[PDB]
Design a protein around this ligand. Sequence first.
Ligand SMILES: Cc1ccc(C[C@@H](CO)Nc2ncnc3[nH]ccc23)cc1
Ligand SMILES: [Cl-]
Length: 167
Amino acid sequence: VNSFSGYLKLTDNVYIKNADIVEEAKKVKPTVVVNAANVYLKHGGGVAGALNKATNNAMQVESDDYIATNGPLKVGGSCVLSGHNLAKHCLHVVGPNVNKGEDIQLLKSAYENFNQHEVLLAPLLSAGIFGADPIHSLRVCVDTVRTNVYLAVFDKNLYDKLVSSFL
Ligand SMILES: Cc1ccc(C[C@@H](CO)Nc2ncnc3[nH]ccc23)cc1
Ligand SMILES: [Cl-]
């Protein structure tokens, strides 16, 4: 039993809800919140910009030190950093950004990072400003993640299409 509330159950382990991941994380304070990161951990917009704003830019400060030490992530890769005031940990995961021409096949590799954590609050990878079809992203999530994932979809219209079109 966990403290996630109001989710629709899609499969044994995947759940989905219309919610602002920022507000969800503050309420639940999950062990792991997933960020829709880029390889440079520059959290300028989208989910990443919103999560960083909620940390008063502490996420960005920590991220800049991470990059200065380790260099950029790989597309499809991840790193674990602090969750600041939002969660215990933040798993920064880089899905392909279609608006950069990045290979959509890497979306499965991106979701594989979730399997290293028993329970996660997450957005749909490569959705929003990363340019991929959120319906496809949900399919890859369900077919790749085996741990317990709570998917937060900010847009109410998009959420209804995801559910009503889910197979
Ligand atoms: C119309 C539309 C907008 C955005 C998306 C992508 C989605 C991640 O896939 N973004 C988010 N998901 C959950 N909480 C969030 N808080 C801030 C951003 C955000 C798809 C479609
Ligand atoms: Cl977005």
